[PDB]
Write a protein that binds this ligand. Structure first.
Ligand SMILES: [Mg+2]
Ligand SMILES: [Mg+2]
Ligand SMILES: [Mg+2]
Ligand SMILES: [Mg+2]
Lengths: 415, 417, 415, 417
């Protein structure tokens, strides 16, 4: 009854949970935890640090990362969150090793492997700085990871959520698409789950976070803006949008648009810490519309916005773009992210370098290196590549093990 | 048995591929170790045949380090004729432990083979998108040259590692004469050489594995003996010329590190490898010429390999470097850590841009990506790049074309691109 | 047009494909293969060897294996196929490392990792025998692997099938359950896919087998015997069984039983090489019923039967059990398998050994060892444990590399 | 900094845990290497504390090799108080390459940690099923003792491996004094010893890693020097007593293999380990007594570890063996390859049964499983065993109990069991 107490208590009495329904008991959670409590330091400090930041910052902008090096540069650049894109993992970082489109094709433990990758890189960055006493950068920046539609049912979602926390994610996002026909937000052929089925996914995620004993941030996303199909008419709430027309597959045609997005947003809002409307373009008016509707029933709900590379941020005007993030943080969009920054950064950079190189050999490469040296004074250390990867950290381990007598120390003698 | 031994025996004596190569074992030994069936390894064969051919056809072949499928994919698209696979890059950002490590054989031994397989599956999906659309004649199956470090242990770990590289579809593999338990990056201190006889055993085990796998995989013998001023032992008469007599606390022996200790190693290894690589501390034309001249006196025409390392300050303005050393026999040239510097510098520049100017910094990259299209860059159309069109073609074939949930038709990539 | 030829030809003209519909062109397959052909020796010889065996044997009985050692003993015992149970992988051999029930909880590339495991063990067994010339056992025995419901949609099935072939499976089985609510055949709460959706999975698998250029054997399984729920009324064919009643989730109540099993079996039969009816008990009468109905429309269709450890093969009579397999091979069930033999073999053996050991120490262990020695003369080599794992094979590699001068050879000096 | 150094410094000087243990490094060094935060490792701590406690409380602790969660799970259920994790078994049937290997460090170095994590996740699910039902008071969190072989390389690979073991929730880890590139099973020929100073460095690196991970993980120093008649080098004065002068082609040195070379190693290692293990070629009571007496003269009460190996013909009928050697100080006793013999013999007996008598052979096993239930065997009810009841309880909590698709109600395990 005492482990149940120090849980039921926190719910009642913690501002962290104001405007959050949990339609299970603290008795249920402790029945599923098993007989002991396992601490998850990284995911707990993470969840706490992201929650603080979202209330103490004007807003928090992130870029997608599909490597720990990529995330380490985000953090050395001064970003205060990391976005783990399911698209990017599908494209270049999943456990199958295949390039896939964004249709839940990869094995469901792929994203959590990348979260652990990122945290292990950040820890090494922290270990190097600590040993040196060379700077006071907090490398443990919260990671917000894509759980797509949970890769199947309520129990897959549960397992996935447990995986994300084990890995040490600070926040996870679930979308109201059908796992079986899941797509990129900015592709056609999207299929919605009944509102109740999307709400059961969100309860599942939170119950998983409760069993793991961690206040992980849960983002509810809706695809209901473009999505004009749904799997069932079973929820009265959705009958308001169905035409009655049906595809061969059996799915139901629906009136997509900001109305459906808004219907989902208010339904999911009592079960999420942030709400996120996938949009087909970066329309300020629609962002404001979407926000207001949520805020009427859910005053000061933290909202999230995908500043998508699937948009042409130029066909949009130049001064509007410089001010977009500040402009939408205004409406309540306190977590903002460029989903595919890492994919475009990675492909653009290697294509331009390989072409410089094919055309002009090491001259081309010396342009990167020189660009690297000029960037040292701004906090780019990766130019000194052996230090960046912790060659100095492992030298110090060798000196401690050998009491200083090692002749095979790496850094002294290096060229 | 005599059946399979003879196809093998024939090819060893007839194919110009194995000219100037010794095998100190027999076809009978190879078939004894193979098992009762022959398993085909299509991409490893086609790659080894293509890489060899292009080494005897091009002025030279120049590569960059790839640490992801996408990176390798942009290298092919831009016109490069091989992919270098850096174990350093894998240590740092792409190994199966998920840790950031320095170049010291700390990662799990099957890591580079995993990245080889990744790269190959990316290239296969790139071809499949091209094939389906009949929209270009690009060969996306370019040879991968993979880092086997010092083999992660002895002669059997080398055997296993060499087999892994080939199953994953590597065309070339390099082994270095360092002690595995003390392995380092070429450009760090505290390198410990293996006795020469021991370095020769590893290249022999490497050739046994490729013969057993029935694939003519390229082997690059690498020596670290330019900067490495320790050897595990005085057992090999050939190494006594360079041993000072001084021992370390650990029991290692001091050697006179230099170009001569490298020339000694290069000539020991040249019979047992298809290319030879001397690691160097600076881009020195006269060391490269002397090392080449020393190798060509005993193996005229021997293919040589040069690491144009990012550990050097490319401020040698006396470019024209690749052409110059290619004229000395250096046909395979690669910038080991290109992938790490590209990825790392790239995100840092964008992230700093982003902190400062928000979505304006993102717009600049998009608009640089559109500008690269005339050069043949397609990743700005990213749904097509990762094969959304290919999986809609799979969907349409399964449903006979009634599929309602096809992806591209009604995507922001149709309207806005 | 010539790679299309040496495909369209095989279909028309190969007995292997008699009574098999492919509702796509050879043009479609070659459009998806890409520009070259990759040989898969193991999966091709496998598919050929299993197909031969099923026509040249009275029938083929298998046991479930969740390790390569387990499969090596099956083969040294004289079995001619191996059954890769999705249940067992869920229980003790999946890439997540968790014990799960049989509800598609594990990552979707888990089963193909176990097929590659098994083939790598068998190859080592073949390499040892070859080197020695000590016996002529064919260790490359066909593996028949569980693809559950494909872990999502038509494209997951496709990817999974490709995975199974890459791994070197000789046969794969897909079931007409909903991936999202998938269960063990012998559990409650089963949910059927529309017949057309189960038929699209099977086309998907075969198209994948066609792109991979391998005549992989495809088993269609139905859960329609116990399963009394279905996801949609969209297929006219299924309206014959729905009551019109609906659960909260939205699913449709159905009249389960041999009639529904038979409806699915004839629907799936033109798209599969074997048909398999999951049954709630080992009823000879129902097995015969099921067979006859299939054979009327599909004369001499190869059928498959799960002799399930979920049955009490004793509450069944003793002489009926000794003759069951021969009895049902009679009706056309030429592929028969004990799904969970490996799970029960593994848990029973370790529990009885640990208890013997707790009670009587090394005396207990010497009973196993003595049981092991008596079993040598029947073809159990694992008693000589260093040879079993290829210590001799790697010694011979060391002698070849060193030209015989090795002083660190393993076997000479062994105790 | 002084904060964290002192909790550490305190515990080293006060806790009876570290009595008779040297650290040749400082708390300051440990905190310098940790990073800026303390990460907790619950199962590694609770396990190390439980294993230590039970080693000072029980006549002795006896274990069998587990190579799967299920196997470990049956060992706990049957009443055993630890699980041995064999690297040999992992080589053979349970490593991350998926190959069958002999005991020679050919598998990927993160393999045993993966099996440690597997076993722990199985035990966690076993507890969760027990907890949910309030149906027994069994402690399923029994200490796992894991094989780190010779570390897969040098002092840094040992450091990394020791960290992996702890993250995965190992309670104890053993390191052996063999050369990694030549590692063997204890009972094969061609074992090559590391110089003593080198074996000591590895146990020091092992303790640094556990101190840095802030967990009191048990370390077992193992010596192979009873049968191993080669050493890599003559560098260590302590080893000159046993070196004959004869060198091998490879440069290894001949040593006088025996109990004396083992006693020399055991006493070198005892200061740097929590238990000491002498590998032996036969179950000899007088060697075990002499080895124990030699260790207890310098470290009275030192905990000792005995491998009751399946490589021996248990026909020593002069059982009562475990009690006898436990009386000599051998508190941790384990049958390394039990899991492999259990799994292998078990399927072969069943498969031969099955070829001969079909489903009658299966019925016998079922009926043996029912007979074991009175002893407390539950796996015959297999849907419950793998937690079908636990995931139906998860389903009911998510749906508030309207779930139609719960699994057990209307299963053959309800009716027929
Ligand atoms: Mg996504
Ligand atoms: Mg390297
Ligand atoms: Mg199954
Ligand atoms: Mg071992």
């Amino acid at each position: 009854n005492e482990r149940i107490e120090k849980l039921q208590e926190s719910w009642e009495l913690d501002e962290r949970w104001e405007g959050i329904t949990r339609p299970y008991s603290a008795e249920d959670v402790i029945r599923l935890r098993g007989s002991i409590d396992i601490e998850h330091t990284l995911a707990r400090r993470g969840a706490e640090k992201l929650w603080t930041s979202l209330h103490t910052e004007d807003y928090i902008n992130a870029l997608g990362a599909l490597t720990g090096n990529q995330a380490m540069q985000q953090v050395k650049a001064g970003l205060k969150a990391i976005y783990l894109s399911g698209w990017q993992v599908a494209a270049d970082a999943n456990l199958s090793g295949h390039m896939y489109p964004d249709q839940s094709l990869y094995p469901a433990n792929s994203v959590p492997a990348v979260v652990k990758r990122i945290n292990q890189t950040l820890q090494r960055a922290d270990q190097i700085q600590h040993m040196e006493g060379s700077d006071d950068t907090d490398y443990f920046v919260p990671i917000v990871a894509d759980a797509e539609a949970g890769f199947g049912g309520q129990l897959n979602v549960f397992e996935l959520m447990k995986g994300m926390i084990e890995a040490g994610a600070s926040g996870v996002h679930f979308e109201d698409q059908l796992s079986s026909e899941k797509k990129c937000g900015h592709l056609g052929g999207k299929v919605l789950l009944p509102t109740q089925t999307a709400v059961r996914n969100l309860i599942s995620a939170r119950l998983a976070a409760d069993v793991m004993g961690v206040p992980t941030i849960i983002v509810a996303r809706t695809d209901a803006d473009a999505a004009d199909l749904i799997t069932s008419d079973i929820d009265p709430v959705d009958k308001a949008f169905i035409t009655g027309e049906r595809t061969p597959e059996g799915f139901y045609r629906t009136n997509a648009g900001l109305d459906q997005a808004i219907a989902r947003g208010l339904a999911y809002a009592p079960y999420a810490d942030l709400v996120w409307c996938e949009t087909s373009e970066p329309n300020l008016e629609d962002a404001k519309r979407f926000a207001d509707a949520i805020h009427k029933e859910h005053p000061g709900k933290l909202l999230a916005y995908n500043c998508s590379p699937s948009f042409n941020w130029k066909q949009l005007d130049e001064k509007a773009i410089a001010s977009f993030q500040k402009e939408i943080a205004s409406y309540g969009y306190k977590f903002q992210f460029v989903t595919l920054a890492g994919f475009h950064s990675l492909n653009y950079g290697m294509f331009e370098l390989a072409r410089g190189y094919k055309e002009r050999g090491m001259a081309a490469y010396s342009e990167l290196q020189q660009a690297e040296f000029a960037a040292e004074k701004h906090g780019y250390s990766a130019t000194r590549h052996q230090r960046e990867v912790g060659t100095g950290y492992f030298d110090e381990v060798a000196q401690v093990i050998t009491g200083g007598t090692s002749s095979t120390t790496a850094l002294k003698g290096s060229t």
